[PDB]
Write a protein that binds this ligand. Structure first.
Ligand SMILES: [Mg+2]
Ligand SMILES: [Mg+2]
Lengths: 53, 211, 213, 212, 51, 211
């Protein structure tokens, strides 16, 4: 990125936003003045045979 | 059996990617993946006749992977969109199996199933489909009488999702809120499980806010 | 009419990929596409006599696909680079349409448009172009008077982006202290929505730290 | 009208990648894309009873993008697979429009359409579907009577695809070879157009190889 | 980028081969002792020539 | 049975991505999956009574998905790396099953298996492992006596990979040259189809030139 403002702060990074037909049209506008509802992404079980790392 | 669950677990792991979820939605055409998923989940609970979960089993982790994949798909905007247009029968099966499972039976399966229903409720049509399903309010009451705190938490999270947003608002949602077990939600708002106590507190604020 | 919106919607879906965005700019037909995009968006807005939008069949979905594509293109480094070099008129149209849309009217179109202005601001020339556009500061404080929280979040995110370059922010001095809605930004730093709350909290931190440093 | 064709042309450009083709498969469910594509192509050729070609116009550019996208989708294994399972009506429309278009009329549209039928024929079921479609052999004869060499070349390429690969290879495919315009293929094998001459040359070598 | 054979003769490079469910199962086995049939990928028209 | 093949087929589809292959290898069930893969492939071939090459309706589509996944994993640098370090029993099984399958039997399975052995041979240790396997040179000549051109092409591609990098070739040279069929490879140098034409032509310019 020759152009692009490359900020001198790590925690103040500029992060771009992408949109989707279903996210924008088929989803409920769940970002409100109460709270934002967001999806749950599950990750497989680490069976009751857990050795270590 | 063992091989089937290993492949399903692998698919559950990679399904956390949007790119993989998009790729799964086309496959359902040739191999009815979501149509046979519901049948496999239905077959599993039917097989637990006079018994509760066995866990650490090859069959247990197969259906966990199935309900985990359905959740991870529903977590993606086009995934929940696909499910409510194409796999309405799978949604029927999830809702049916939640009411068919007795309290304390298949706790981890019920949580995973409740998480996929919350995800599909993020989609406008998905919210209507779930809330307008037969015996939905009696099911919410039934699931809140479960002794497991994690199950109760995910029922409250689904109820919160249903409470929020218009839903016509002209006594269509006004009667939904009044018909909830407010005494149980109150009891869970003073719970010793911090995650459950905060979900019931948040839901109580939302019920009071819209009253 | 229906066929046109179906192709725009597919293009919106695939435009989330950097590889597709590069391919769109590479084909010598993107320049026409982006010039007529602004005309179609302007035509759609002017056609609304208030009301709402009633999810217009393949009409709203068509302009939402258009703003969605502009947003997804600007999200890629060479996409926001292309826009500020070739499609400056489209940027003019976006800024115009944001001020032309009344609060509460076409909320989803305003967030898609405010998302693309933040994305183009990531490019140094894009930040210069947006911030030096006619009633830019009056537009910002006015878009904050929108009751929708998502619109307010994306206005704060754009404000933070110009505020984060105190060289660009120094040209638009005086009115940044005179007209800023400190009270509304303060109220936003107390919202029960954490993403809106911390956006206003972080903008307040940067606004108070620049007036003193 | 102009905006519609510009979006379709961009989609045709990006559809050359497998990644984009997978992403358009699935999108046809909520958009009816391949179902309305056939209707738009059918509406275009039915709108022009007269005129051989109304070129440069955004109406022709729109349908060129549509047939180009159908070809690029069929070029990907899951794309031709999807078409023969879900969009059989679009295949019907392409085959119908090829027979409805008179020789010399919309030459570039006929080539693009013939290229998508060759691509879907790469799929086993797609070969079965095209070859068993009504009036298919009379259509092959009709398309080979076109004066444009590029059209003739793509008909020969489809015929070669149909000749190769066992269609059970008993007497279903044996009768197929007998019913071809072998006089025209031999005339095209001595053609002055080198791409066409070599296509007819290769098809003749294949036909002679499978002769009992 | 470490444990694999990185050959010096660039003209005889090692190129890996990927497979697909439809390509392997639903497609005709078109790599035959006659010739290999391959798909056509079209690219949009560049009308009025390049500038 | 049907559910198992549907999950495997989806995994085969998504495994064409490097990002998915990295994610698969970084999984606790990954070592299990590849261990039971070889067992499932071994079990499948030990069921054929001649019949058709594949009997279809899953089972064959399950093992085609399995060999397809092994191929797609080996196609990625860390995938072939993982296989030679962790799954060398799966490599043993592939090599065994290639010699166990009679010519003309399960042609599509043999090609997929030969493609995965070429891909693992791209890894230095993978080349060492395959070339030093028992009866490897006799296997190469038995596979070249297959009437199917695609099988022959992938055997020649593996042979070329083995003769490239002369450290491994100048060890089994006495076994390869004093056993190489000059009535099959020499006759196969025919023009017929171009990808076979150049496969034997490039091999001739390396195998014959030993000076
Ligand atoms: Mg029941
Ligand atoms: Mg007709």
């Amino acid at each position: 990125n020759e152009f692009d403002r490359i900020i001198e702060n790590q925690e103040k990074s500029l992060k771009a936003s992408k949109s989707t037909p279903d996210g924008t049209i088929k989803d409920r506008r769940l970002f409100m003045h109460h709270v934002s509802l967001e999806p749950i992404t599950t990750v497989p079980f680490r069976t009751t045979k857990e050795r270590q790392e | 059996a063992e091989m089937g669950a290993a492949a399903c677990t692998l698919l559950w792991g990679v399904s956390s990617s949007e790119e993989v979820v998009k790729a799964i939605l086309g496959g359902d055409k040739a191999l009815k993946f979501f149509s046979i998923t519901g049948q496999t989940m239905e077959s599993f609970v039917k097989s637990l006749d006079g018994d509760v979960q066995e866990l650490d089993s090859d069959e247990s982790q197969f259906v966990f992977a199935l309900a985990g994949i359905v959740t991870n798909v529903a977590a993606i905007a086009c995934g929940r969109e696909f499910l409510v247009n194409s796999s309405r029968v799978l949604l029927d099966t999830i809702l049916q199996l939640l009411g068919d499972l007795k309290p304390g039976q298949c706790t981890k399966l019920k949580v995973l199933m409740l998480m996929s229903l919350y995800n599909v409720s993020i989609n406008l049509k998905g919210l209507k489909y779930i809330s307008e399903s037969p015996g939905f309010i009696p099911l919410l009451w039934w699931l809140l009488s479960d002794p497991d705190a994690e199950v109760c938490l995910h029922v409250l999270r689904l109820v919160q999702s249903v409470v929020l947003e218009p839903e016509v608002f002209s006594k269509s949602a006004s009667e939904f809120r009044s018909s909830l077990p407010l005494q149980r939600i109150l009891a869970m708002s003073k719970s010793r499980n911090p995650r459950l106590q905060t979900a019931a507190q948040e839901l109580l604020e939302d019920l009071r806010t819209l009253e």
